[PDB]
Design a protein around this nucleic acid. Structure first.
Length: 305
RNA sequence: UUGAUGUCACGGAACCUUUGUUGUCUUCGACAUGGGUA
RNA sequence: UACCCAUGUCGAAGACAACAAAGUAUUU
């Protein structure tokens, strides 16, 4: 939700999507303006809810784990090979929905047509395809995925790189870093992740670093959130109780002895010493038919009595 | 800024009454933080 | 729009509440 200009109502967004900000696969911090980052100018993003995945042998007669629930909802088509790189193969696809086509890169399974050993330019194959939730957004359409993006307008909710694990002693991620750990940056906008927790699948990027008095930090947030489809006709009134609870939430955020000692790793509410609701704020809200009941600044937050 | 044959104003204690007092173990364990994957 | 958690660290309270001036016969 978004707090209205009068400061007395909160309007409802219909949707959210994740925006990668601290990974090296994009340039959002270099191309978005300050008031777009601050969440006080609306922006227009490309959004994809579902992403396609292929198999080049029928899942129903595929060995092992693909006579499986995810593949129960099959869809069929034909694919044309057009490029190969790093063992990945590039296909244009036509599904059985008349004319309905898209390009995608595929990293073959062992049973994908002899793992595509010996396939050649211009060839084509019968295929099966599924779609799975992706719910991500970008300002510019990434290369290697040029199709299926929907243009939407909304606001960016930028909290900062505040999901951090820290210790006085070296854990599993730090032990396996393979390098000299960086120093803690001074500016929260320059942080970029430098390896992964699951380095085979390359899920879950992290930023590992060390400070001058011997603490080790692992920041494990790389996405930031995009709010879109603002409903004009759906205000909810903020009662006085909701403001008191929010002020108490802010007080407990800013008076924490157990807080991470480096403020670049704190959320905007704590890092910036926020003290009130203000017009135009972006927030998560709980409501009844007419009134706001609970307000929090981040996705997993605190609940006040 | 006096008025004149008449001024005890050195003719009148800012005096009298009121408790800085009432209540409070130098004690003590679970809590911080916000995403990630499809 | 469903699923899943992850990390180990750290002192708190340092006066508060009340009162903040009020009374002080002249007569059946």
């Amino acid at each position: 939700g978004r707090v209205t200009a009068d400061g007395k109502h909160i309007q409802k967004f219909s949707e959210t999507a994740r925006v990668p900000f601290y990974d090296k696969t994009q340039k959002h911090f270099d191309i978005l303006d300050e008031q777009e980052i601050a969440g006080e100018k609306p922006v227009r993003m490309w959004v994809k809810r579902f992403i396609k995945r292929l198999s080049l042998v029928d899942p129903a007669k595929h060995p092992q784990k693909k006579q499986d629930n995810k593949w129960k909802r099959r869809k069929e088509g034909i694919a044309t090979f057009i490029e190969q790189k790093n063992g990945s193969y590039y296909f244009n696809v036509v599904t059985n929905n008349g004319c309905t086509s898209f390009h995608l890169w595929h990293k073959p399974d062992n049973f994908d047509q002899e793992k595509l050993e010996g396939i050649q330019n211009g060839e084509k194959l019968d295929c099966w395809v599924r779609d799975s939730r992706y719910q991500k957004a970008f300002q510019e359409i990434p290369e290697n995925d040029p199709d299926g993006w929907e243009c939407k307008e909304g606001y960016l909710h930028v909290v900062g790189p505040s999901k951090v694990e820290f210790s006085d002693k070296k854990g599993d991620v730090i032990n396996n870093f393979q390098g000299t750990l960086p120093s803690v940056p001074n500016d929260w906008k320059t942080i970029r992740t430098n390896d992964f927790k699951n380095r085979k699948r390359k899920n879950e990027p992290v930023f590992c670093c060390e400070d001058d008095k011997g603490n080790y930090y692992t920041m494990a947030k790389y996405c930031e959130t995009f709010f879109f489809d603002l409903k004009e006709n759906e205000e909810y009134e903020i009662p006085e109780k909701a403001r008191i609870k929010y002020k108490e939430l802010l007080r407990v955020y800013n008076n924490n002895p157990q807080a991470v000692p480096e403020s670049v790793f704190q959320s905007r509410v704590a890092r910036e010493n926020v003290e009130k609701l203000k017009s135009g704020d972006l927030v998560y809200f709980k409501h009844n038919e007419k009134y706001v009941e609970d307000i929090v600044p981040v996705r997993i937050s605190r609940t006040v009595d």
